[PDB]
A paper describes a structure:
A well-known example is nonsense-mediated mRNA decay (NMD), which detects and degrades mRNA transcripts containing a premature termination codon (PTC) [reviewed in (3–6)]. In turn, phosphorylated [name] recruits [name], [name] and [name]. These three proteins share a phosphoserine-binding domain similar to that found in 14–3–3 proteins. [name] is not part of the [name]–[name] complex and has distinct functional modules: it contains two EJC-binding motifs or EBMs and harbors an endonuclease activity that cleaves the PTC-mRNA in proximity of the ribosome.
Based on sequence analysis, we engineered a soluble construct of [name] [name] that spans residues 580–1166. We found that [name] [name] was a monomer in solution and had no propensity for self-interaction. We obtained crystals of human [name] [name] that diffracted to 2.1 Å resolution and used SAD to solve the structure. The model includes residues 580–1159, with the exception of disordered loops at residues 711–715, 823–878 and 955–963. The overall structure of [name] [name] is similar to that of [name] [name] and [name] [name]. [name] [name] features the typical 14–3–3 like domain (α-helices α1–α9, colored orange). It also has a C-terminal helical hairpins domain with seven α-helices (α10–α16, colored teal) that are stacked perpendicular to the 14–3–3-like domain. Additionally, the linker between the 14–3–3-like and the helical hairpins domain is longer in [name] than in [name] (68 residues in [name] as compared to 11 residues in [name]). In the structure of human [name], an aspartic acid (Asp683) is present at the equivalent position and would be incompatible with the dimerization observed in [name]–7 [name]. A detailed analysis indicates that the phosphoserine binding site in [name] is more similar to that of [name] than [name].
Numbering used by the authors: -581 to -580, 580 to 710, 714 to 822, 879 to 954, 964 to 993, 998 to 1159
Amino acid sequence: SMELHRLLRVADNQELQLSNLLSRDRISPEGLEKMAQLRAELLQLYERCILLDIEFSDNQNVDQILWKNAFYQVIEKFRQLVKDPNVENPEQIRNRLLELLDEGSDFFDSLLQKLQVTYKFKLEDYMDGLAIRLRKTVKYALISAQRCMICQGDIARYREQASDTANYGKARSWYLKAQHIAPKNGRPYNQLALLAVYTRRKLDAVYYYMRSLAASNPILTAKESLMSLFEETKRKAEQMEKGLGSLSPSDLNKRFILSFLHAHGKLFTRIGMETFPAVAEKVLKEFQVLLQHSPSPIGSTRMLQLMTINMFAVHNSQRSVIQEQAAALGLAMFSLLVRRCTCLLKESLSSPEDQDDQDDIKVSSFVPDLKELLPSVKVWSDWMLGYPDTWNPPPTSLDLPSHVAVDVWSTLADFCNILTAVNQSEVPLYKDPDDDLTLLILEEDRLLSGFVPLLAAPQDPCYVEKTSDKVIAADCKRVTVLKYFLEALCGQEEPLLAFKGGKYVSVAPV
């Protein structure tokens, strides 16, 4: 304990010297030598601490301080010198920056191995949060390891920029591996959002910044980042403002993403909401057409990002008009998804009471266009069970300029009706583990792991035989979840759906 405090005591004084050296407008070749000397002592000091007592280190923020003092400060000073016209040999300074980055990459590669050796674990045994199984020291060593991976990403990104290139592929891989370690940390999403802005992937950038805000450890800076992004979107939408079934999938898609971001800008910035109803109708109209294209121009992964942003807007909205309008938009897009899923199902039937078991729709017969949409339908339905008071009673604040409404509850009743003819028993699902069984995790639940709003929906483990087809198994689980969802809505106190006169129907208000 006293040895640790002794180590940090030395470090702070080392840092005081480094900070002062860096304050200078220029750094002599003698100044650069001393800096190298200071950084090396710093690293040895910090690393010893980490490898002596990881929990102490975490509590003293040694990782954060290591990065800030020995790397961030220095890197940023170098970037400034290279651009200073007062600097006579900028290319030589660039070269020292590259060198420092490469030595940086080695340092963190080495520290990652040491963490594993010192605290006795392999990283690959902890990359699946959804694995049901932590020693207090391994908990903290994983936390630190995640920080090392974020540092590797930042180093890789710095390297690209120092080289006037933009192959951000390595940086992204480091951030993705960091997110896997601990999905509740907002920082990996924030850094991934930055990569998206560099590459002008606007929707991904908004998605990831929102992930960063809706994490257990949020990155508040993401707020300002989004304001700036949405300001830029507002401009581009207003600029593009100076039939749908005729456009190509690609053109319609590009148009849709812009409308969608425009609507969410208004919701996020709370500016220009007086014309939210018109942008919302535009979003829904375009979304409705994109759903009819085969294969989906949008795709499951993007669809899930859309659902995520919709859920975020509903929570970020606090029951105000704005919160009702966010919920209305989400519910409407959810409804159009379900409707399309219904068409798809019945493209593959008698009346409910008259359904014969030999005519049931087998899950293994699901067409690929249906399979692409079900993960998003399931995740939104999870969200709804999590926040029943946002949609029951239904929001009433959104009135589209055409006054044509989307009937969520009738659409859900129809879905319930076609679903009764679906047989999901091809792969039996079990509540309890067994030697012949194994854990079924859905790809969409993995993706959204860490998203705080979804922490309120059930997480009940699900087991299937090791011999079962895992694709069919996953869809049988989705169908079971949606059937339970629809049952839950029928069993609600003041229910919006009911089985009535031989079929499921809407009993929601006019």
